[PDB]
Amino acid sequence: VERIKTTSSIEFARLQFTYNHIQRHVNDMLGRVAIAWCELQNHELT
Amino acid sequence: VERIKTTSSIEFARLQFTYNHIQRHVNDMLGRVAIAWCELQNHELTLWNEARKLNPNAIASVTVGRRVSARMLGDVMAVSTCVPVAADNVIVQNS
Amino acid sequence: VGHRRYFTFGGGYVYFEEYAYSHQLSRADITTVSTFIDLNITMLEDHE
């Protein structure tokens, strides 16, 4: 038995969500870019 | 006639501004990247045409996705899959 | 001998056999292989 203590700023969690959303997007897109870039290099080798 | 009620946290709006600024930037830049990537693909198609005229076997093998023999039939390629052979079943004559 | 050829002609091809016209072909009548490399860049959606 205890009592929990709650912060007074959601902004930590809203930053967490914004940063995670943007990071998912940019990581996914730059990963697609890098994958397509490898495929382009291997493809241009011919 | 009414009274408006104001929140006590601008941070919703500051997050909105930060997220919108970053989103405008990244959407614009990734859109430019995708557009330039399409232009690169359409632009490289010419080199691919020339190569397929040069060594149709290699280009067909890369493009189709498997080792295939090919030859041009004018403006199209005729492909035919190649039979794999085990490495140990190959002998080189010395001369 | 065995002279089969497809020549680009307008929007499609003009298939030839034994140095004789056979018929025109629609562009999609022939299987298509892509030298392009897909870069499926979708866009960060608006979030409120």
Structure overview:
The structure is cut from a larger assembly and holds three copies of chain A. Chain A is rod-shaped, with a radius of gyration of 20 Å. Chain A is mainly α. Chain A starts with 10 loop residues before the first helix and ends with a helix. Chain A has one helix spanning 11-44. At the B-C interface, helix 1 and helix 2 of B face strand 1 of C. Chain B: Homotrimer; disulfide-linked. Interacts with host receptor MYH9/NMMHC-IIA. Interacts with host receptor MYH10/NMMHC-IIB. Binds to heparan sulfate proteoglycans. Interacts with gH/gL heterodimer. Interacts with the host coreceptor PILRA. Chain B: It is found in: Virion membrane; Host cell membrane; Host endosome membrane; Host Golgi apparatus membrane. Chain B: This is Envelope glycoprotein B.
Descriptive labels:
3 chains, rod-shaped, part of a larger assembly, 46 residues, glycoprotein, antibody, 1 helix, fusogen, viral protein, mainly alpha
